From Swiss-Prot:
Ubiquitously expressed. Highest levels in brain, heart, kidney, peripheral leukocytes, placenta, skeletal muscle and spleen. The gene is MED25. Residues 15-163 are annotated as: Interaction with CREBBP. Disulfide bonds: none annotated. This is Mediator of RNA polymerase II transcription subunit 25. It comes from the Eukaryota. It is found in: Nucleus. Component of the Mediator complex, a coactivator involved in the regulated transcription of nearly all RNA polymerase II-dependent genes. Mediator functions as a bridge to convey information from gene-specific regulatory proteins to the basal RNA polymerase II transcription machinery. Mediator is recruited to promoters by direct interactions with regulatory proteins and serves as a scaffold for the assembly of a functional preinitiation complex with RNA polymerase II and the general transcription factors. Required for RARA/RXRA-mediated transcription. Residues 11-163 are annotated as: Interaction with VP16. It is linked to Charcot-Marie-Tooth disease, axonal, type 2B2: A recessive axonal form of Charcot-Marie-Tooth disease, a disorder of the peripheral nervous system, characterized by progressive weakness and atrophy, initially of the peroneal muscles and later of the distal muscles of the arms. Charcot-Marie-Tooth disease is classified in two main groups on the basis of electrophysiologic properties and histopathology: primary peripheral demyelinating neuropathies (designated CMT1 when they are dominantly inherited) and primary peripheral axonal neuropathies (CMT2). Belongs to the Mediator complex subunit 25 family. It comes from Homo sapiens. The chain holds residues 391 to 543 of 747 of the full protein.
């Protein structure tokens, strides 16, 4: 896809003062039923999401893909991963504007007490495998906890897959 008309300039206030590290598409599958069929042609949602790091942050990003895949799981079960949310790198997702209707879909999902495990493809020679997207209904910002652990966090998410 030769993107001739490439889009630019979306630095609307949502953070206090953070720098833009990454800008690409976050796509996921909604889980409306624990049993039906669950294949392609389900509830597919996708937004242009922006990852803001804290100015001189260790995260170089760069080699990260133009698109990441996210997993909708109940936030009830994440309470078991207590230390895995404390040993993490807290960043913010602007989602390029906050008034999108597919984004109001994501406000609805996480408003029902759900969360989004963002599983990365091939990014860079050792950096980020996975992070947890957690919307703050308090401060109206989307959070991204990157556990410096990574591997043991995945083992937790594997057990949360059940049902």
């Amino acid at each position: 896809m030769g993107h001739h008309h490439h889009h630019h300039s979306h630095g609307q206030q949502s953070v206090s003062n953070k720098l833009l590290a990454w800008s690409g598409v976050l796509e996921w599958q909604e889980k409306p039923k624990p049993a039906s069929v669950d294949a392609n042609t389900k509830l597919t949602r996708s937004l242009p999401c922006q990852v803001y790091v804290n100015h001189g942050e260790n995260l170089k990003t760069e080699q990260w893909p133009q698109k990441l895949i996210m997993q909708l799981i109940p936030q009830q079960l994440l309470t078991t991963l207590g230390p895995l949310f404390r040993n993490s790198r807290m960043v913010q997702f602007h989602f390029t504007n906050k008034d999108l209707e597919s984004l109001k879909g994501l406000y609805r999902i996480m408003g029902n007490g759900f969360a989004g495990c963002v599983h990365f493809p091939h990014t860079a020679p050792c950096e980020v495998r996975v992070l947890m997207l957690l919307y703050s209904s308090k401060k109206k910002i989307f959070m991204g906890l990157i556990p410096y652990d990574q591997s043991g966090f995945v083992n937790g998410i594997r057990q949360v897959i059940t049902n």
